[PDB]
Amino acid sequence: GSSGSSGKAEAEQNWWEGPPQDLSVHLWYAGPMERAGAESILANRSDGTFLVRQRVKDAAEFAISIKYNVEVKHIKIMTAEGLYRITEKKAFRGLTELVEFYQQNSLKDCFKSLDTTLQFPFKEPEKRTISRSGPSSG
């Protein structure tokens, strides 16, 4: 018999210039995804399934695509002063905000042709529950 010594430990300390809020944490955040994908992802999804993707680049021109009229539509996202907005009508701190806003107002504002609204993300997990949740405050 013979003894031996092997092994190494690690360290978890964020001391770098880590980036801001990780939009990735969101479900409607499919990072740098190609059109095809979004078109093949929401293709089967249910009408209303929205998904935000980038232009195969870091913090590139964001774009919102959802399932509407049986077709995967896409919307350009303009950024100004750090704010995100598809149209020069109203800007928000970030996607979460911008999207959250459209979730109540149709996108027609920017594309009269595209009269839809952010329903649910593409990453959204299956929705098969005998009974839905709804804890009333009372």
Curated annotation (Swiss-Prot):
Modification(s) after translation: Phosphorylated on tyrosine residues by HCK in response to IFNG and bacterial lipopolysaccharide (LPS). Phosphorylated by FYN.
Domain SH2 stretches: 28-122
Reported effect, R53L: Loss of interaction with SYK
Expression sites by tissue: Widely expressed in hematopoietic cells but not in other cell types.
Disulphide connectivity of cysteines: none
Subunit structure: Interacts with SHB. Interacts with SH2B2, GRB2, GRB3, DOCK2, SLA, TEC and ZNF655/VIK. Interacts with SIAH2; without leading to its degradation. Associates with BLNK, PLCG1, GRB2 and NCK1 in a B-cell antigen receptor-dependent fashion. Interacts with CBLB; which inhibits tyrosine phosphorylation and down-regulates activity. May interact with CCPG1. Interacts with CLNK. Interacts with THEMIS2. Interacts with NEK3 and this interaction is prolactin-dependent. Interacts with ITK. Interacts with PTK2B/PYK2. Interacts with HCK. Interacts with PTK2B/PYK2. Interacts (via SH2 domain) with SYK.
Domain notes: The DH domain is involved in interaction with CCPG1.
Further comment: 'Vav' stands for the sixth letter of the Hebrew alphabet.
Annotated protein name in UniProt: Proto-oncogene vav
Covered range of the whole protein: 629 to 775 of 845
